[PDB]
């Protein structure tokens, strides 16, 4: 995976997550400069890890003014943007117990802000004829007990990816989505006791490949779709879930024998 | 389609539309008492045609107080609710031009309000072990130039229908969705000059059956899902689109010959 | 579910199964005459159960001559056909171990014969402007360990339903598919020891409604799609799986807590 | 797209097509040795252009003996196989007019032969822990007037890809599918008069990116899935259709204004 994006500028919302950092590292390795937009303060340490190749701009993407200031800062230090990876999300989700206020807050963060960040960067993507990668999930294709806000948000991102692709094609902009499964996480690393081999064995029941996915494995699909190798890929959903989405409630274990 | 729902009470949000009116008539014909919830005043005339079996309650479903008051009125005049048909929607939609405020307004009406209305009626549906029918569209499965808010909202309804089905199954409540195509509407009647055969001639290009759908044809599918005949149907999306969703950009005309 | 199909003639392939008999009973109750085409000899006892309302014709649907003779017999005793329910299938399936010969045999029975039976009856369905119901499964939407031939066959039936719908619409024929989950079976009844409550509890892990589906519940969806109430439904897949297809490998039980 | 597959051996059925040729070049450029299997003699000229790195073996994949002989020749000249790209297909397709014999012939070539070729190479892929790429189409997700056999065959390939992924995962083999749209082909070049801009002008109505896809653009997606960058991708369908599959019968043009 030795893609060349020398001189290009990329924007990565929600870059403080393990997936985010892997996407940032993948872009830097390809020669691109990256601007990390996030509300989490740990993004600053990630940006400093790459020195002048990556910049961190703490941004509340629900604030239109914060987005305009972030794009102004990107223009001042880095330049015109070619790639946008919308990875920002909230895990505010209590299913039926979540309130109307929680719903609108989660939708604003997970969905509406993706439109505003794309709009603030549109003239850049139009001039650069760039590409956009949004993030769906296996939760956008299936129901999970007790989780409403994030699955519905991700199912909405999936449709937004298609409508953006259609209405952005005239300007030469490609828009796709990436659908990962269970990926090694900061939250999983803490609840597991930083025990990967046990967390992998728990995940084996839901992934044909028998483990959690690595952030790097997700980042590879993001870079491919951003690169010109995917020059005829737009509006598509690229699954990187180790086979999660090919299975149903029976999993990968036989079910008929239980009847006897 | 001679189902018996005598004595059962149904609630139909967005009942002032042609679809709503057909669903109301279908339920009344089946012996049910109906409460019409809508922000449009044309619902008042619809309820009066059925005398004491149908009630109209002008309701802004984005107002929690309005929902509580609407359920209180249903309790006083009709009683415990068995069926909820979530048909309320807004067509506030300017594609990419729609603002952040427009996004949240459309999501509040189309999606979040469905949750609050379901929550206010949940104890009724649980005691009656009723069924819920949400409304998706052909727009939830495909992209349409210049239309973002309504397609994305309906794509979100599809996932909400699945998560509602899962978390409501334990209480014996079935939740499904209906996906219609181009159906004869008030808006089509005005742009058409109340010319149905002319509007049918345009829609033939997008429906295998060569016309717009009738509101009654949609209501038939709604009534089936509400009835006990659909007793093993939950979490499903039932298409009533005259073949719209089996086609792609080529339509129903050959395309290869055009290359010669 | 009190549909009126008085005087109409229906054809039910594979009518010897429990689903088949329920579909036959549903049609008779609606006033239709039914011809059961099947290779199983137990269909004769089913036909005699309805006396002159149902006729049995032992037919090897892989034999073109057998199909022509069956349609000739239907014309002699019953008349012009209005409804065709393609329920015939084989469970010849050993996954990767199944041979090329097994593959072509299963595809011929499950898929190709559906085309020939439809072709032999086409002029009837064209004159009567009838409807066709094919049978998919939850296995057409998901992978099941050790089962290749039947899932692939059913996934192919799903596409065939769409292509038939498109190319049959000009003649006023509607074509749809029905996708059931685990339904109480002859095979399940024997391996379970005719113990339904235990078989239901095993199936609860894969169906939101917590049991196997009843053949009658599947038959209701078949009759609806055949009837004129579904007059704007063509090319659609109507799920009657109790919520099986909304779930993934996590089922309906929490999965995050296992990580701790 | 600078992947290193030095020393690895790949097999490409149906390698005489433009897609096949692009996939062969992509693999050779990545350092792999390639065996071209095809019934078309034009594959012989393709292999000779790469000298000793690419081999051509004229093979009727419906003949079990031909497959065993083809694997024997691969073993003698190149060695153990790591990658299998199932691209062989037939366009024998007359829609409803196709006969039972035509159906089984098309299914044998398009679908069943993929199983036999995979079975003959399985021990290689298991020892090498390789990956398999099957070919679906935009025709597997939508109906096209007058075309049954190829759309249904490809819809069956999609499910086979999922069941292969599940039952091959235990052995470390990844299986995915690629779904292209209208791609520049030999057949299009002949009806087009070898006029690409004219063929592009027709395809713009069905692809958001306004042209036919290049064979290389499809090959890029095939190469990614074969490579270790897709190490958490199994059982997925990767669309490379220029936005074809996000559209419905309305295409990318507004349709509501037509009603006025």
The CA distance from A233 to A221, in Å, is 12
CB within 8 Å of C49: residues ≥ 6 apart: none
Rounded Cα distance, C76 and C80, in Å: 9
In the 8-state DSSP scheme, what is residue C230? G
B146: Cβ–Cβ under 8 A, 6 or more apart, which residues?
A: A167, B94, B95, D254
Buried b (16+ CB within 10 A) or exposed e, B121-151: bbebbeebebbbbbbbbbbbbbbbbebbbbb
CA nearest to D120, candidates D61, D176, D34, D78: D61
Q: DSSP secondary-structure letter at D160?
A: H
The reported resolution of this PDB entry, expressed in Å, is 2.4
DSSP state string for chain B? -----TT-EEEEETTTSHHHHHHHHHHHHTT-EEEEEESSTHHHHHHHTTGGGEEEEE--TT-HHHHHHHHHHHHHHT-S--EEEE--------GGG--HHHHHHHHIIIIIHHHHHHHHTHHHHHHHT-EEEEE--GGGSS-BTTB-HHHHHHHHHHHHHHHHHHHHHTTT-EEEEEEE-SB--HHHHHHTTS-HHHHHHHHGGG-TTSSPBPHHHHHHHHHHHHSGGGTT--S-EEEESTTGGG--TTTTS--GGGG-
3 state DSSP class of A10: strand
Region of A51 on the Ramachandran plot (φ > 0 left; ψ -120 to 50 alpha; else beta):
left
Q: Which of D141, D145, D249 sits opposite B254 (nearest CB)?
A: D145
Q: Which long-range contacts (CB under 8 A, 24 or more apart) does A56-64 make?
A: A61/A13, A61/A37, A61/A88, A61/A109, A61/A113, A61/A116, A61/A117, A62/A108, A62/A109, A62/A112, A62/A113, A64/A116, A64/B100
Q: D8 phi and psi, to 5 degrees?
A: -75, 150
Residue of C205, C206, C259 lying closest to A192 (CB–CB): C259
SS3 state at A250: coil
* Residues B195, A16: Cα–Cα separation, whole Å: 57
| Beta carbons of C118 and C132 less than 8 angstroms apart | yes
Work out the number of other CB atoms within 10 angstroms of the CB of residue D91. 11
The residues pairing with C176 across neighbouring beta strands, listed in sequence order, are C133
Say if the Cβ atoms of C209 and B1 lie within 8 Å.
no
Which subunits sit against C, judged by 3+ Cβ pairs under 8 A?
A, B, D
Given the residues A83, A91, A122, A150, the one annotated as active site: A150
Give the CA angle between residues C17, C22, C28 to the nearest 5°.
125
Structure tokens at A199: 């967390």
Distance separating alpha carbons of residues A244 and C246, to the nearest angstrom: 14
- Strands in B33-38's sheet, in edge-to-edge order, are B54-58, B33-38, B9-13, B83-86, B131-135, B174-180, B237-240
Say if residues D155 and D147 touch (Cβ distance below 8 Å): no
| Residue in A with minimal Cα distance to D251 | A166
Q: Token digits for B61? A: 């479903």
Q: Which residues contact B127 (CB under 8 A, 6 or more apart)?
A: B80
In angstroms, how far is the first alpha carbon of chain B from the final one? 49
CA C227 to chain centre: 16
Rounded-to-integer distance, Cα D75 and Cα D78, Å: 6
Separation of first and last alpha carbons in chain D: 49
CA-CA distance, B240 to C3, in Å (whole number)? 19
- Across the interface, do D100 and C107 touch by the CB < 8 Å criterion? no
List, as own/partner pairs, every contact residues D63-67 make where C-beta atoms lie below 8 angstroms and the sequence separation is at least 24, other chains included: D64/C100, D64/D116, D67/D116, D67/D117, D67/D120
> Do residue B246 and residue D205 have CB atoms under 8 angstroms apart?
no
Of the candidates B220, B231, B245, which has its C-beta nearest C217's C-beta? Answer: B231
Q: Does A100 touch chain C (CB under 8 A)?
A: no
For residue D141, which residues of chain B lie inside 8 Å, CB to CB?
Answer: 248
A13-A15-A18-A21 Cα dihedral, nearest 10 degrees: 130
Q: How many whole angstroms separate alpha carbon D138 and alpha carbon B78?
A: 51
Tell me phi and psi for residue A179, to 5 degrees. Answer: -115, 95
**Which of B156, B65, B144, B59 has the alpha carbon at shortest distance from B106?**
B156
Among candidates B2, B166, B220 on the partner chain, residue whose Cβ is nearest the Cβ of C230: B220
* Number of alpha carbons in the 13 Å side-chain half-sphere of residue B149: 23
Helix (H) or strand (E) run with residue A12 in it: strand A9-13
With a CB cutoff of 8 Å and minimum separation 6, the contacts of A206 are A181, A182, A244, A247, A251, C248, C249, C250, C255
Q: Considering only CA atoms, which of C138, C139, C140 is closest in space to residue C162?
A: C140
Q: What is the CA radius of gyration of chain A?
A: 18
Residue C201 sits at the chain D interface (C-beta within 8 Å): no
Direct distance between the N- and C-terminal alpha carbons of chain C, in angstroms, rounded to an integer: 49
Domains of chain B: 9-259 (3.40.50.720)
SS3 state at A26: helix
CA-to-CA dists, residue B119 to A150, A219, B58, C185, angstroms: 19, 39, 19, 38
User: Are residues C248 and A188, on separate chains, in Cβ contact within 8 Å?
Assistant: no
Q: What is the spatial distance between Cα C191 and Cα C210, in angstroms, rounded to a whole number?
A: 20
- Sequence-distant (6+) residues with CB within 8 A of B208 are B242, B243, B244, B246, B247, B252, C165, C166, C169, C234, C235
C-alpha–C-alpha distance, residues B129 and B125, integer Å: 5
Q: Is A188 on the interface with C (CB under 8 A)?
A: yes
Q: Could you give the CA distance from residue D238 to residue D135 in angstroms, rounded to a whole number?
A: 10
Task: Report the half-sphere exposure of B152 (CA within 13 A, side-chain side).
Answer: 34
Instruction: Give the residues across from B58 on adjacent strands.
Output: B38
> Inter-chain contact D104–C108, Cβ cutoff 8 Å?
yes
| Cβ proximity of D254 and D225 under 8 Å | no
Helix (H, G, I), strand (E, B) or coil at A133: strand
**D212, D200 in Cβ contact below 8 A?**
yes
Q: φ, ψ for residue D200 (rounded to 5)?
A: -60, -35
Q: Phi/psi at A245 (nearest 5 deg)? A: -80, -5
Residue C212 DSSP one-character state: P
Contact C3, B1 (CB under 8 A): yes
Report which of A209, A147, A218 is spatially closest to residue A184, judged by C-alpha positions: A218
Closest CA to B237 of B171, B155, B169, B182: B155
Which of C150, C206, C238, C244 is catalytic? The answer is: C150
Three-class SS of residue D130? coil
CA distances from D8 to D28, D61, D83, D86 (A): 10, 23, 8, 17
Measured between CB atoms, does B79 come within 8 Å of chain C? no
Q: What is the SS3 string spanning D66-124?
A: HHHHHHHHHHHHCCCCCEEEECCCCCCCCHHHCCHHHHHHHHHHHHHHHHHHHHHCHHH
D6: which residues sit within 8 A by CB, 6+ positions away?
D30, D31, D32
Tokens 């409304």 correspond to: B135
| Residue D61 in tokens | 């994949």
Nearest to A248 among C199, C247, C253 (CB): C247
- Are the Cβ atoms of C208 and B236 closer than 8 angstroms? no
Nearest to D244 by CA among D139, D159, D90, D104: D139
CB neighbourhood size of D11 (10 A)? 30
Could you tell me if C212 lies within 8 Å of chain B, comparing CB atoms?
Answer: no
Structural tokens at position D51: 């000298």
Residue A23 and residue A84: Cα distance in Å, rounded?
A: 11
Which residues of B belong to the active site? 150
Catalytic residue status for A244:
no
Breaks in chain C after (C-N > 2.5 angstroms) = none
In this complex, do A235 and D252 lie within 8 Å of one another by their Cβ atoms? no
Report CB contact under 8 Å: C112, D96: no
Report the C-alpha gap between B151 and A111 in whole angstroms.
13
Dihedral sign computed on CA atoms, order D144, D149, D150, D152: positive
Q: C53 touching D, CB under 8 A?
A: no
Distance CA B176, CA C208 (A): 13
């Amino acid at each position: 995976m030795n893609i060349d994006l020398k001189g290009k500028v990329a924007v990565v919302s929600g870059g403080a997550t393990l997936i985010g950092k892997a996407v940032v590292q993948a872009l830097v390795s390809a020669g691109a400069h990256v601007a990390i937009l996030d509300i989490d303060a740990k993004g600053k340490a990630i940006a400093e890890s790459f020195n002048h190749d990556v910049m961190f701009i703490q941004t509340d993407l629900t604030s239109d003014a914060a987005i305009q200031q972030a794009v102004a800062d990107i223009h001042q230090h880095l330049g015109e943007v070619s790639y946008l990876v919308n990875l920002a999300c909230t895990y505010l989700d209590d299913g039926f117990k979540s309130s109307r206020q929680d719903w609108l807050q989660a939708l604003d963060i997970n969905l509406v802000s993706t439109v505003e960040l794309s709009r603030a960067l549109y003239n850049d993507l139009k001039k650069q004829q760039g590409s956009i990668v949004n993030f769906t999930s296996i939760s956008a294709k299936v129901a999970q007990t007790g989780r409403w806000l994030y699955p519905v948000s991700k199912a909405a991102i999936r449709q937004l990816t298609q409508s953006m692709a259609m209405d952005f094609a005239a300007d030469g902009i490609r828009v796709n989505s990436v659908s990962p499964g269970w990926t090694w996480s900061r939250v999983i690393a803490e609840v597991s006791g930083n025990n990967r081999e046990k967390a992998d064995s728990v995940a084996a029941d839901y992934h044909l490949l028998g483990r959690l996915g690595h952030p790097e494995e997700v980042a590879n699909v993001v870079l491919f779709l951003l690169s010109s190798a995917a020059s005829f890929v737009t509006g598509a959903d690229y699954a990187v879930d180790g086979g999660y989405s090919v299975m149903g409630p029976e999993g990968l274990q036989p079910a008929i024998p239980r009847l006897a």
